[PDB]
Amino acid sequence: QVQLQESGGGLVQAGESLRLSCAASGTIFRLYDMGWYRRQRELVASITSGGSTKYGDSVKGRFTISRDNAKNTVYLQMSSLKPEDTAVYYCNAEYRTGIWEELLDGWGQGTQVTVS
């Protein structure tokens, strides 16, 4: 019964900066993976348990992904926003709830960011 909560939405004009955040809550043994997905599902950012990051093809690495382990939090820093980035962004996570159990993921609600 693990639930995720997102924060950091807004609506402004182009040429600005923002920061999104996602955080888990419930009974967890460990968390293994997080990420962010645009719009329709497509990868834009993903981090691991160790720290080896990765990115997507439609963005040329201009965003920044970071993870706080002790509070189970993942962030996203957006800067120099283009007018073609008006969509709905979603969070994700993977977890386990016991040492003798099965790996299973779980999505989140979503957040809206509008840019011109």
Binding site: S49, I99, W100, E101, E102, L103
Partner: peptide, 23 residues
């Protein structure tokens, strides 16, 4: 080893079948 690892045999079904005989 069971505490430190993520996915044992490359699939979810073989992992969750391997994690119960030990118990």
């Amino acid at each position: 080893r069971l505490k430190s690892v993520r996915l044992l045999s490359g699939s979810r079904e073989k992992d969750r079948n391997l994690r119960r005989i030990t118990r």
